[PDB]
Structure formats: C-alpha cells, structure tokens
Amino acid sequence: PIAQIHILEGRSDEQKETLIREVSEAISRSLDAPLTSVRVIITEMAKGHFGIGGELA
Amino acid sequence: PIAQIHILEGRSDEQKETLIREVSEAISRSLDAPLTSVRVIITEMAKGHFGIGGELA
Amino acid sequence: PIAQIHILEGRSDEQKETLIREVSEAISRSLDAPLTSVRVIITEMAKGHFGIGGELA
Amino acid sequence: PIAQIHILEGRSDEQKETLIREVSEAISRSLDAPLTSVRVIITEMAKGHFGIGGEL
Amino acid sequence: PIAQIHILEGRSDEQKETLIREVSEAISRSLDAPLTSVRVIITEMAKGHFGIGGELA
Amino acid sequence: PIAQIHILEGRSDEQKETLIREVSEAISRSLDAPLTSVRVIITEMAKGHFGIGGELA
Numbered sequence A, B, C, E, F: 001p002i003a004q005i006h007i008l009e010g011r012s013d014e015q016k017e018t019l020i021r022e023v024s025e026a027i028s029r030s031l032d033a034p035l036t037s038v039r040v041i042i043t044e045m046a047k048g049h050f051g052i053g054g055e056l057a
Numbered sequence D: 001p002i003a004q005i006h007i008l009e010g011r012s013d014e015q016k017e018t019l020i021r022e023v024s025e026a027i028s029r030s031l032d033a034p035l036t037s038v039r040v041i042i043t044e045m046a047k048g049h050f051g052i053g054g055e056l
Helices: A013-031 B013-031 C013-031 D013-031 E013-031 F013-031
Strands: A002-008 A039-045 A050-052 B002-008 B039-045 B050-052 C002-008 C039-045 C050-052 D002-008 D039-045 D050-052 E002-008 E039-045 E050-052 F002-008 F039-045 F050-052
Touching: A002 A013, A002 B013, A013 A039, A013 B002, A013 B013, A013 F050, A039 F039, A050 D013, B002 B013, B013 B039, B013 C050, B050 E013, C002 C013, C002 D013, C013 C039, C013 D002, C013 D013, C013 E050, C039 E039, D002 D013, D013 D039, D039 F039, D050 F013, E002 E013, E002 F013, E013 E039, E013 F002, E013 F013, F002 F013, F013 F039
Parallel strands: A002 A039, B002 B039, C002 C039, D002 D039, E002 E039, F002 F039
Antiparallel strands: A002 B002, A039 F050, A050 D039, B039 C050, B050 E039, C002 D002, C039 E050, D050 F039, E002 F002
C-alpha cells in the first residue's frame, strides 16, 4: 500500500516522524498487510495553497 | 489533512471502512488535528496496473 | 496547468462535461494561461472509498 | 469534492487566491455541491520539474 | 521512486505491461537507482473524464 | 499521458531533466502517443517525508 498524506505546513520533523509510523502501522493492521510493504509520502501545504469553500484556511 | 491510499484490489468493504477509521485516528492523534477534519480517499489498483521493479506485482 | 478533481459517484455526463469546461476556463482566466494548455482529470470515488472523520461520507 | 491543481511556479499570492476562489465556485456550480464542501490544493512546480514532450 | 501515470482507457494489457517495464527502466537508468526500488502505478481515465482546453478527450 | 514521479530530494537539475526526457520517450514509445502529448511532473520528497515500513527510508 502507498499513502500520500496532505498536511498543513508547520509541524516538526519529530511530529512527521510520528505521523509516518502511526499511519503505516494503521494500514498494516487494518489490511493485514506486511508492515514492510507500506509506504507513506507526506506532502506539506503552504497556507496560501489550501482552500476550503473558496477561501484560505 | 487528506490522505490518499493506493491499495491492491481484493479487500472487503469491512477492511476498507476499518482502514479509513484507523488511518484517520492515526492522523488525528499524530498531528493533534480534529478527527472531523481528516479526509481519506481509497484508490484501488488492478493487478495489471501496479508494477514493482518493472514487473507486475 | 493540470487539475485532478476527486468527486463522489452519481453525477451526470453533462455535469462532468460542464465541470471540465468551467474549471478549465476558471483556471485560464485566473492565471492568464491559454485555455488549450489546461488539462483536467476527473476521478470518481465509490461510496465506500471516501472517508470523513473516520467514517464513510 | 477535492481538486489538486498543478501549476508552474512564479505566480503571486493574490492570483493563487483568485484561482482557489474561481475554481471552487466552478466546481460547486457544476456539481450542485455546497461551496463549503469544496477543497482545493495548489501544488507549485519548479520550472526544472515539469516536462512537456520530454523537454522543460 | 514512485511513478503514477494517468492514461486514457483503451490500451491492451500487454501495452500497459510494456509501459510499466519501459518506464521503470527509464527511471532506473536516469537515476542510477536499483530497478527493484521502482514502483509504477497506472491510472486509467474514462472517456468522459479527461479534458483538454475545456473539452473532452 | 501524464506521469507524476515522486523521488527523494538531492539530485542535480540536469539529472532530473534527463529523467523527464527518458520517461517521456518510454511513455511515448510504449503507448504510441505523440511525444508532445506526454507530460511529466517531478515531485521531490524531503528525507523526513518518506517512510518505508513506518520508518524513514
């Protein structure tokens, strides 16, 4: 499984490290897939690049 | 936050609902983001559409 | 410019054709880019494949 | 509805703001979807990262 | 490396296998990356779902 | 055809230009599509943003 997660910029390296591990374990557990087969890509969004309802967040 | 997860075809409806819930909670805990703000997209891959090392998986 | 739009299943062909035209024109005018350079990809999501707050939408 | 738009780098903040607003109404109107449910992600591409016909 | 390729539906299975092998090798040679680390995802587009210049493909 | 390739950060501009060219030709050759129709997007991943098996790669 391959996961791409879009998140707002501003979290620490440590926090993103935690995100990758926790999500990867979640995918492995949910799907009964080998942990080693799970890849996660974190994509950061700048504040001026993410809109909800046509307006900036 | 928005997660798009590519997975191989063959999973049950039950596994995919669990995947969405478990990845969403993992995201929520890891980033201290409200659960209600987490969105997850499941994308299924057919066996002839996923390659590893230039060969079909 | 390349736009990928994830939408829920259930929309008509005209609605999607209109979606493609209006989004392409909106991109073209906002960015002063030639309409002919604008590409739009519609990706339909099955009901069990889209999550909000850890639950199906 | 969620739109991810890949655009070339170099545009200013006001133009990207306009892009977000204009695309969001277009999606909303076309699909008879609530404006507030429409999400737009702008992804900027550096000039050395986007190829057409094998060349930048 | 992870490659996602959007193409219009209508190609043969053989044709998509060739695409996956050829793209994987091109990535491998260009990056001096082991072929085995290269993953390719093919995403097919339905005829009514791809727009160029505001018009259907 | 549109290919998005996620690669780890750190390559020079000329190597990525080579990657774009070689992948584009492979796609053109495999699908018998006019090269002018092939679009390729390079997306660099920071080291702290790419996980394999829940750990940074």
